[PDB]
């Protein structure tokens, strides 16, 4: 029983770690998306 | 109640011309007078009071039945819906989720473009070797000029046909978009008339 308890606490630790790193990936992707859309909007505003 | 409903029938909500219901002021009143004459003649005011108390309790319990709608599960209480509104309650995607499905469609388009790269680069070499075989054969300058002109004509006619096909397809998409937009504006005037 104490073995299962240690595996589920390590399990939830890994879950919170993967949540945080996919959140960081979300931030990086959103930053790139914002920069690309700023460039596109400026370029096509000058174009049209 | 029919008399007061004709009094409180909304004139602006009437699609036809407004009907001044003075015939409902008079003839319905006379029929009501006959019914009230029978009611008062056959019956005492005391059990009139008893039955009026009973009907006031009926109206109070009629309101109480709708007040007692909290018998459902008190878990995330939101969306006050119509009584038995289940079939028409389609799971419309939210502000984000519609854009999620749209980005799924554009990602499918991205995969289609990625396959288009491989297809176009593989089939490009067929035309390249075909024009190289045109150059390889023993043909005159005028023959090769006719070959180039016909190659360009066969490019242009079918490219123009494909341009028409894609332009009319996206114009049909815009037409379906406006066919959805007409429902939007009609529902907007419905909400304004509701106000």
């Amino acid at each position: 029983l104490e073995k299962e308890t240690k595996f589920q606490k390590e399990r939830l630790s890994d879950l919170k770690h993967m949540r945080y790193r996919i959140k960081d990936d979300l931030t990086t992707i959103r930053h790139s998306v914002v920069e690309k859309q700023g460039e596109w909007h400026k370029k096509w505003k000058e174009f049209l | 109640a029919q008399f007061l409903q004709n009094l409180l029938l909304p004139q602006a909500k009437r699609g036809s011309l407004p009907t001044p219901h003075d015939d409902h002021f008079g003839t319905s009143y006379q029929q009501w007078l006959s019914s009230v004459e029978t009611l008062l003649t056959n019956h005492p005011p005391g059990h009139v009071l008893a039955a009026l108390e009973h009907l006031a309790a009926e109206r109070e319990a009629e309101i109480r039945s709708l007040c007692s709608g909290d018998g459902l599960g008190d878990t995330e209480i939101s969306r006050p819906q119509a009584p038995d509104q289940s079939d028409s309650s389609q799971t419309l995607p939210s502000m984000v989720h519609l854009i999620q499905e749209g980005w799924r469609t554009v990602g499918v388009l991205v995969s289609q473009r990625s396959t288009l790269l491989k297809e176009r680069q593989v089939l490009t070499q067929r035309l390249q070797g075909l024009v190289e075989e045109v150059e390889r054969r023993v043909l005159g300058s005028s023959e090769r000029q006719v070959l180039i002109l016909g190659l360009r004509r066969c490019c242009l006619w079918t490219e123009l046909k494909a341009l028409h096909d894609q332009s009319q397809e996206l114009q049909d998409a815009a037409g379906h978009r406006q066919l959805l937009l007409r429902e939007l504006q009609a529902k907007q005037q419905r909400i304004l008339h509701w106000r």
């Binding site: 998306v33 | 999620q100 990602g107 473009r113």
Partner: protein, 31 residues
């Protein structure tokens, strides 16, 4: 449940990024 929430959100944003990259490259090459 919240994990599915951010999975769908990041899927939308990643397909958005793919669309932006493809649009940028098409404007780079075709003009």
């Amino acid at each position: 449940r919240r994990s599915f929430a951010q999975v769908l959100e990041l899927s939308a944003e990643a397909s958005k990024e793919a669309a932006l990259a493809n649009q940028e490259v098409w404007e780079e090459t075709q003009g």
